[PDB]
């Protein structure tokens, strides 16, 4: 029975923590989950297995098979990564800290291309297949996987963009800039539709929006900042918002929904040290997930109540919530041990 941290009348558990008789009652879930002293970015594929965790020094790819509970390989890529996506299964696209883009396959490293300026984010379009890559400046580029061309790059404002995302059920391209404007483009028209401005009441310094998200209803939009302040948005009276100051507030990097499992209207926010979870329409914290080290980013596995972080320590932490949901079919005795 794994120990649980104190919270607001709710329980969470960590597996593979910094502390995790213990040697002979080990509770290790995924073997060889440890990197070279940090972690870049972890995400779980669309199907029921094959999670991918990017590397730290001699950076790797680290695909874990969930139905084998261990590592498959580690393709030591050429440069250090910041952002990537997964395109179903075996294909995936990455971009590194330099302005280069790798295409991993089953054989690995299908191509290495580049963008003219230093990039910061990448997303893929399921409809007509053009990956949009956000970079520094006036420049939000396309690499269409149909015919391998380049497209007429989207003209931005001065400094650039920290995050780009497209909406799923209808395709509304977000681009979180530096000057508080969110710069919604249309993936149909290749033109702007709106230049929504973000406001507060504290106004410490001119914050920059760093996280953008949507969900599968296509009506709301989750917004971030460089200050530790979550925001919600709708088309219904789109000028105000609801806001969420966080108790430490450095830079929120991961805001993701719970739009496919039970216990609805709930959202996860995540800044550099803490990751919390709260409810819509009130703004009150359901739980929080305080680790012993900082967080590079997180992810949430679909269908069930578990979370996978990428942090600055040697292992990665997984966080199980036995009130948000169960443990999945490949982890189907976590509810028997704890």
């Amino acid at each position: 029975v794994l120990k649980s941290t104190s919270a607001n009348d709710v329980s969470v558990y960590q597996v593979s923590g910094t502390n995790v008789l213990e040697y002979q009652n080990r509770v290790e879930l995924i073997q060889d989950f440890e990197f070279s002293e940090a972690s870049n970015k972890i995400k779980v594929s669309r199907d029921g297995q094959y999670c991918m965790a990017t590397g730290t020094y001699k950076p790797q790819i680290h695909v874990y098979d969930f139905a084998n509970l261990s590592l498959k390989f580690d393709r030591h890529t050429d440069a250090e990564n910041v952002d990537f996506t997964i395109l179903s299964w075996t294909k995936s696209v990455h971009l590194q800290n330099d302005r280069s883009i790798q295409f991993q396959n089953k054989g690995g490293l299908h191509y290495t291309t580049r963008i003219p300026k230093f990039g910061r984010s990448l997303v893929y379009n399921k409809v007509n297949c053009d990956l949009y890559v956000g970079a520094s400046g006036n420049e939000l580029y396309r690499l269409n996987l149909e015919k391998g061309r380049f497209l007429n790059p989207f003209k931005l404002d001065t400094e650039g963009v920290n995050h780009v995302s497209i909406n799923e059920v209808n395709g509304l391209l977000a681009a979180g800039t530096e000057t508080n404007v969110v710069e919604f483009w249309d993936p149909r028209s290749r033109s702007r539709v709106s230049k929504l401005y973000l406001e507060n009441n504290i106004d410490n310094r001119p914050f920059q929006v760093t996280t953008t998200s949507f969900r599968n209803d296509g009506l709301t939009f989750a917004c971030g900042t460089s200050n530790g302040y979550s925001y919600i948005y709708d088309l219904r009276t789109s000028e105000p918002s609801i806001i969420k100051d966080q108790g430490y507030g450095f830079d929120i990097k991961k805001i993701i929904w719970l739009d496919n499992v039970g216990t609805e209207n709930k959202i996860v926010t995540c800044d550099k040290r803490i990751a919390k979870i709260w409810d819509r329409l009130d703004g009150k914290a359901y739980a929080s997930m305080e680790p012993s080290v900082d967080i590079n980013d997180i992810e949430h596995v679909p269908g069930t109540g578990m979370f996978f972080t990428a942090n600055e320590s040697i292992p990665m932490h997984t966080y199980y919530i036995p009130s948000l949901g169960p443990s999945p079919r490949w982890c189907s005795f976590l509810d028997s041990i704890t």
Partner: peptide, 13 residues
């Protein structure tokens, strides 16, 4: 081996 999961057989390192 002591304490992994999954009471079927799996291929580890």
């Amino acid at each position: 081996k002591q304490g992994v999961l999954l009471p079927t057989r799996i291929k580890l390192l």
